[PDB]
Amino acid sequence: KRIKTFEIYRFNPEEPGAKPKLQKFDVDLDKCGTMVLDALIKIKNEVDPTLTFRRSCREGICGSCAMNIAGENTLACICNIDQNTSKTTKIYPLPHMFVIKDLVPDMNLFYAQYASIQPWLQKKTKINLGEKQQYQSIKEQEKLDGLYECILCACCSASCPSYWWNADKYLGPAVLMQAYRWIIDSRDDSAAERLARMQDGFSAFKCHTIMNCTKTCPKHLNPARAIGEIKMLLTKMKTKPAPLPTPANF
Amino acid sequence: TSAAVTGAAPPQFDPIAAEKGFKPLHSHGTLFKIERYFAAAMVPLIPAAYFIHGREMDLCLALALTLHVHWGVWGVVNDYGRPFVLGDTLAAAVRVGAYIFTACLLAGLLYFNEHDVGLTRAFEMVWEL
Amino acid sequence: SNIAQYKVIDHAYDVVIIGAGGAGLRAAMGLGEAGFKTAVVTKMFPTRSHTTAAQGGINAALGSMNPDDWKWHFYDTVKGSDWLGDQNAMHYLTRNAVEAVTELENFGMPFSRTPEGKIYQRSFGGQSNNYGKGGVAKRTCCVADRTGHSMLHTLYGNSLRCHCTFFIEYFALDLLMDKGRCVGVIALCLEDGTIHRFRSKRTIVATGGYGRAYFSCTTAHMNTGDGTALATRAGIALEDLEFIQFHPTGIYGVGCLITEGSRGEGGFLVNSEGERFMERYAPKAKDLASRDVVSRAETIEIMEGRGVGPEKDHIYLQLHHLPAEQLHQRLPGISETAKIFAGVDVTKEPIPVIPTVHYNMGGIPTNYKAQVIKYTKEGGDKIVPGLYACGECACHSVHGANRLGANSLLDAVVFGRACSINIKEELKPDEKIPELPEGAGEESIANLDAVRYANGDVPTAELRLTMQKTMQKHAGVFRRGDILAEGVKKMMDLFKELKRLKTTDRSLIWNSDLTESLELQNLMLNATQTIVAAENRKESRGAHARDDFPKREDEYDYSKPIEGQTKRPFEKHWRKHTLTKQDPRTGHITLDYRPVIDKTLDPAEVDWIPPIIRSY
Amino acid sequence: EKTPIQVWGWDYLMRQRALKRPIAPHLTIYKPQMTWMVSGLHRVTGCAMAGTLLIGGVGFSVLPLDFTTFVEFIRGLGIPWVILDTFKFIIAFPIAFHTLNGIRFIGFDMAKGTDIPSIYRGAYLVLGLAALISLAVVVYPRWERHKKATLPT
Ligand SMILES: Cc1cc2nc3c(=O)[nH]c(=O)nc-3n(C[C@H](O)[C@H](O)[C@H](O)COP(=O)(O)OP(=O)(O)OC[C@H]3O[C@@H](n4cnc5c(N)ncnc54)[C@H](O)[C@@H]3O)c2cc1C
Ligand code: HEM
Ligand SMILES: CC(C)Oc1cccc(NC(=O)c2ccccc2I)c1
Ligand code: SF4
Ligand code: F3S
Ligand code: FES
Secondary structure (H helix, E strand, O other): OOEEEEEEEEOOOOOOOOOOEEEEEEEEHHHOOOEHHHHHHHHHHHOOOOOOOOOOOOOOOOOOOEEEEOOEEEEHHHOEOOOOOOOEEEEEOOOOOEEEEOOEEOOHHHHHHHHHOOOOOOOOOOOOOOOOOOOOOHHHHHOOOOOOOOOOOOOOHHHOHHHHHHOOOOOOHHHHHHHHHHHOOOOOOOHHHHHHOOOOOOOOOOOOOOOHHHHHOOOOOOHHHHHHHHHHHHOOOOOOOOOOOOOOOO | OOOOEEOOOOOOOOHHHHHOOOOOOOOOHHHHHHHHHHHHHHHHHHHHHHHOOOHHHHHHHHHHHHHHHHHHHHHHHHHHOOHHHHOHHHHHHHHHHHHHHHHHHHHHHHHHHHOOOOHHHHHHHHHOO | OOOOOOOEEEEEEEEEEEOOOHHHHHHHHHHHHOOOOEEEEEOOOHHHOHHHHOOOOEEOOOOOOOOOOHHHHHHHHHHHHOOOOOHHHHHHHHHOHHHHHHHHHHOOOOOOEOOOOOEOEEOOOOOEOOOOOOOEOOOEEOOOOOHHHHHHHHHHHHOOOOOOEEEEOEEEEEEEEOOOOEEEEEEEEOOOOOEEEEEEEEEEEOOOOOHHHOOOEOOOOOOOOHHHHHHHHOOOOEEOOOOEEEEEEEEOOOOOEOOOHHHHOOOEEEOOOOOOOHHHHOOOOHHHOOHHHHHHHHHHHHHOOOOEOOOOOEEEEEOOOOOHHHHHHHOHHHHHHHHHHHOOOOOOOOEEEEEEEEEEOOEEEEOOOOEEEEEEOOOEEEEEEEEEEOOOOEEOOOOOOOOOOOOHHHHHHHHHHHHHHHHHOOOOOOOOOOOOOOOOOHHHHHHHHHHHOOEOOEEHHHHHHHHHHHHHHHOOOOEOHHHHHHHHHHHHHHHHHHHHEEOOOOOOOOOHHHHHHHHHHHHHHHHHHHHHHHHHOOOOEOOEOEOOOOOOOOOOOOOOOOOOOOOOOOOOOOOEEEEEEEOOOOOOEEEEEEEOOOOOOOOOOOOOOOOOOOOO | OOOHHHHHHHHHHHHHHHOOOOEOOOOOOOOOOHHHHHHHHHHHHHHHHHHHHHHHHHHHHHOOOOHHHHHHHHHHOOOOHHHHHHHHHHHHHHHHHHHHHHHHHHHHHOOOOOOHHHHHHHHHHHHHHHHHHHHHHHHHHHHHHHHHHHOOO
16 A cells, blocks of 8 residues: 555634644545545545535636645645655645634635725726627737636735735735736726725735745736736836727627 | 524625725825836946946945835835734834934945945955955 | 534525525625625635536527527527426526626626627537527537636626625525525524524525535535525425436546537547447537437447447547647636646547536426425415525426536526516515514524534445445436336435434534535435436436336327327326425425426417427 | 725734634745745845945944954954855855846836746846856956966066
């Protein structure tokens, strides 16, 4: 048998005087799926049902299982288990987030911030909600690629040392890329008002180009590039192009 | 058993309700831009001072480095002078201390260029060793 | 409630939605827009909902690629159902498609585009122009590979404007019933172990499906059929549960869905010969035949030794013959998923795939307005006051016996909206929030405690598995009356093993041992009802295929001409909805049967579609 | 003054405190990566330099000592020539690397060079050029001082 050993952060808020721990669990790799999630499940089901984590989609699309494996923030469900058994693989929750139990962090500041950007299409001319399609060219919509893929997993926000130290004022890479996904949407009018909401010295500008976000994102996306883009926009070094005009026959 | 107490709504940011009555404008934008333009300008200066020395370069190094390091430490200070970890008065004392650090820095350099060898010369004298 | 204390917490809402996927949210938006104090209860953050995992698209006759007609879509949808579909509801679904999907775009859903700037549409399974006479239709609006992801994130986004108040990671235990009327929901808050009773004039059930009833599925770990469990526990009979869709192309080893979009963009299935075998099983639509026909096609090829791989037990889905510019523009996610899970460069090798449990056309019965219904033989469709259901958890029935590809995201948005629309126009503000009856939810709490401290020999994960394993073997793609009977026999035994449950985690705060056990109970209800229904349906229709009854039994023989036949009575044919009534504690199920509604909503708008032979 | 969300955020931090919930480990556990190491370095150098200018400028002013009698004190020790030029190298590198990486980061501020290959190339290039310039500026004159000691007149 090939026995992999995991070091898995524990915390029980129920118990009095309780302090975080690290617990070793041995997993027979031959009786277990390829992915780190698989091990956690195996361990929960066969060894310790009190082991507590988030999951849904088994394919890397929900973002619920985001955690810190092997030092980096990734999704457990598409992280291959490290086959070499002389290593112990370490599993902590998303760094610098308040925890509830084990690998489940309080995710609500994250969410509130994503509400703050107003993640929905705005138009300065009231539209008849069902009636016809907004024009947008291919080129225009292709600006949304690498931006709309974000699954809200928080891996990157929780890898940003600035968002560690100032989660309360600096929005962080996840929420900021999404703020930018609605800014450069040609179908959206309110670019100016969106930028007004993060003018101050913390909201956007506490990005100190550390780059751990674009690195760690398990979806192969780039927030540091999007933020950079916001800085240019926020300092008038650039502007949003106006929407390509909606052709007569449409 | 179900003998119970009326609940309340869970805390939750209402982005529209928050929007009513907050308009405020303080663009850090134009301030950020110049901090960078200034660092870009210092790129020539740093080697300019490798080659050309004197009491006049000592002065421009002393002025650029005072102003750049002012904005430097200020940041570092806002990044770690956090009220959650320090509580406001003590953390506003770190904010203020970023300015004392700027003013002592200059004072010290000016002195050093006026009643001592100067920056460029001081560098020469360690490189001669 | 015996052996512990529980903080109960009471709330008063106009309408309470259990669910925050497609259906759930679209309903919430319309309600909050129309003014209502709306509360949304969901056991996971709404973006993690299974809707986010959807891929291929959402159907509407936008005509962005070629002229189109919602009546053609209507047609294809009914032919889809193998005439188990309620045509009034299938009418509402398709009439309102163009508008529903336009809204999504008007909300900022970032659809892929045509050169003209319009919403891009791809081809898909079981669709056609001119009422089946024309070609392979292009109705399936897609955001590339990840249509479900984009749609849900958009709805969620726009649900922050509607002032709808969210309760995130609350596990719904039961409906709060007061003499046949629903006055709310009771749930467990995971963050603190508090128990919550929501009083509300309405309750919309939008909880998704029950894929995890089986060993292998494309569904998420959270597809546990809670909403159906809830209804079953409120004494509501569930409809059509035996109709379980096997998506033709889930990845062999892992169940991860590979989209039908990948065929409708030009991919095909291939056997061990190298043959493109779907040209035999369905000459007209080839690899875009309906889901039940394709899956069965593969399943035979496996049986008859044309399987592929080491053990010859899956087939290949081939895409490498397509341009890479098209493979990345149209199938980027499954490009990546096939890499991660099957080791497959999709532009050079084929993907190992195999039919896989995917959708649940069955569920909570409703009328065209999505109002839950109970059925008597002699009184008929009697609506349950206060309760509504939509999305996978419902059986409207818009899918009957076979769900069409890209019709569910549609059903969720359309009938989700329909809930808000139908409630605005039936709920007036003289009526106040229902006062709870005394002892409301006391039993639901009793179950919690019981499961929470459960003692017995058999742990909760062991039982789930043998549920899942049993079900995979006995209620599969091809079924027989003896296998099924033996499968009921085993399932009803597993229901009894529930009393010997072991749990281990004793906490109230974020206890996944506990909630997964609640989920297991819920899954048993669905699985037991699913199989007895399946065991008794002595015919073959849609997904449900009996080897030992391979004909589709309708009122007439629709393969002879019709004039000069005599209508078989209700009791002797099978063109009816199966109804399953389970005593939750004993587990005993009794069947009943309910006529299929054939009228459209308005004959001056569209003519009902008579049954024929289903030939793709 | 704060945005509304930043108000919310602080109120959030207050609950998190009051619930005596722990903070998930971070620097102790996060993998070393060229992304952040180098940021760390850029600040560490940036700061050290300022600190030297302050302890220097102000130090020599508030002391009876001056810079000339300091350079004799150390010379007096007559420490080996390799050690000295290493201390020189140590002085050059902060100035070089920070100056270089300073421009790098200004790219990152402008969305430029932000993909992972650019991030890693950028990193190495800037560590290289800085070390090269630091090794040149130390050695080159010391090399000319050996040419002086032993050449033809
Ligand atoms: C892999 C995959 C791909 C698909 N692709 C497509 C496609 O391309 N096109 C298409 O039309 N259809 C597709 N479908 C079908 C379609 O996506 C689903 O039928 C649809 O997403 C269902 O939406 P829903 O809101 O009814 O439920 P879901 O999206 O399943 O959401 C269920 C919600 O109910 C909540 N819930 C469940 N139990 C409880 C409880 N006890 N308490 C509180 N809340 C609870 C959950 O928290 C969740 O928020 C796909 C399905 C799968 C599995
Ligand atoms: C010669 C060209 C230089 C350039 C282009 C430059 C550029 C920059 C930039 C862009 C930052 C911001 C980094 C961030 O936000 O993370 C910065 C920070 C800083 N710089 Fe420089 N710099 C130069 C030289 C110097 C010098 C000579 C000193 C000497 C003391 C210095 C001290 C600092 C300090 C203290 C900071 C603090 C902020 C931080 O690390 O976050 N810099 N510099
Ligand atoms: C342990 C690593 C991953 O993380 C850490 C830990 C401590 C400090 C830092 N780095 C900063 O704090 C930092 C550095 C440069 C610019 C802005 C910052 I906010 C990173
Ligand atoms: S960006 Fe990459 S990492 Fe950050 S949230 Fe979106 S997906 Fe998760
Ligand atoms: S990790 Fe943090 S500071 Fe900027 S580029 Fe990345 S967000
Ligand atoms: S469980 Fe969905 S991202 Fe891993």
